[PDB]
Amino acid sequence: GSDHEQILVLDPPTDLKFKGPFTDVVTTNLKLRNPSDRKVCFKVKTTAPRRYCVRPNSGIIDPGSTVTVSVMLQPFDYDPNEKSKHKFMVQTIFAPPNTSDMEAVWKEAKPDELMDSKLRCVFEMPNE
Amino acid sequence: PLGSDHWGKGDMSDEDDENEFFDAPEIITMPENLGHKRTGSHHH
């Protein structure tokens, strides 16, 4: 096994769940918590930017603190024979204690210091 | 409804990838892409 976790805790940690008929937008909130004694920049990525929306898109979390990220998944024509192809990814790196620019942290960040984790999109019907 | 004063960065990328990850916008305003199709088709 060659898979490992980022500094940020995620909730749900495994996969993003979308429950509702897909005739309209589904809203799914993801809770991200920081276990560390340091500030950390976060970013969200998705498989389709015209089918998934992420209100914050990115930010910074304080030591011991939590941020809730709302995902808005757009309506589509679901098929019971078709399989889910969609995923989410969250990227994180440590921020310095004295900056006013979050983009500069990602430009000073190295490919060996950058953390990420990945999650699938799950689809569930109301059945009522 | 939702939006920001400056957003939607990142362009000109092309790589081999299992699903293609994108930088997940705050909200969708311009689906797919623009093109030359106007007021039906052909009749040139």
UniProtKB/Swiss-Prot annotation, chain A:
Residue positions, PTM N6-acetyllysine: 118
Site (Involved in binding the phosphorylated serine of the phospho-FFAT motif): 43
Places the protein is found: Endoplasmic reticulum membrane; Cell membrane; Cell junction, Tight junction; Nucleus membrane
Region named phosphorylated FFAT motif binding: 43-46
Keywords: Acetylation, Cell junction, Cell membrane, Coiled coil, Disulfide bond, Endoplasmic reticulum, Host-virus interaction, Membrane, Nucleus, Phosphoprotein, Tight junction, Transmembrane, Transmembrane helix
One GO MF term attached to the UniProt entry: protein domain specific binding
Tissue-specific expression: Ubiquitous.
Domain of life: Eukaryota
Topological relation to the membrane, as annotated: Single-pass type IV membrane protein
A GO biological process held by the record: protein localization to endoplasmic reticulum
GO cellular component assignments: azurophil granule membrane; bicellular tight junction; cytosol; endoplasmic reticulum; endoplasmic reticulum membrane; Golgi membrane; microtubule cytoskeleton; nuclear membrane
Family: Belongs to the VAMP-associated protein (VAP) (TC 9.B.17) family.
Function: Endoplasmic reticulum (ER)-anchored protein that mediates the formation of contact sites between the ER and endosomes via interaction with FFAT motif-containing proteins such as STARD3 or WDR44. STARD3-VAPA interaction enables cholesterol transfer from the ER to endosomes. Via interaction with WDR44 participates in neosynthesized protein export. In addition, recruited to the plasma membrane through OSBPL3 binding. The OSBPL3-VAPA complex stimulates RRAS signaling which in turn attenuates integrin beta-1 (ITGB1) activation at the cell surface. With OSBPL3, may regulate ER morphology.
Subunit structure: Homodimer; disulfide-linked. Heterodimer with VAPB. Interacts with VAMP1, VAMP2, STX1A, BET1, SEC22C and with the C-terminal domain of OCLN. Interacts (via MSP domain) with OSBPL1A (via FFAT motif). Interacts (via MSP domain) with ZFYVE27; may retain ZFYVE27 in the endoplasmic reticulum and regulate its function in cell projections formation. Interacts with OSBP. Interacts (via C-terminus) with RSAD2/viperin (via C-terminus). Interacts with IFITM3. Interacts with OSBPL3 (phosphorylated form). Interacts with KIF5A in a ZFYVE27-dependent manner. (Microbial infection) Interacts with HCV protein NS5A and NS5B.
Protein's UniProt name: Vesicle-associated membrane protein-associated protein A
Organism name: Homo sapiens (Human)
Lineage of the species this protein comes from: Eukaryota, Metazoa, Chordata, Craniata, Vertebrata
Swiss-Prot record, chain B:
Positions of short motif FFAT: 20-26
Covalent S-S links between cysteines: none
Summary of the tissues where the protein is detected: Widely expressed.
Modified residue annotations for Phosphothreonine: 39
Compartment(s): Cytoplasm, Cytosol; Cytoplasm, Perinuclear region; Golgi apparatus membrane; Endoplasmic reticulum membrane
Phosphoserine PTM positions: 13, 41
Subunit relationships: Homodimer or homotrimer. Interacts (via FFAT motif) with VAPA. Interacts (via C-terminus) with RELCH (via the third HEAT repeat). Found in a complex composed of RELCH, OSBP1 and RAB11A.
Record note on domains: The FFAT motif is required for interaction with VATA and proper localization of the protein. The PH and the Ala/Gly-rich domains control cholesterol binding without affecting 25-hydroxycholesterol binding.
Protein name in UniProt: Oxysterol-binding protein 1
Organism ancestry: Eukaryota, Metazoa, Chordata, Craniata, Vertebrata
Residues of the full protein shown: 346 to 379 of 807
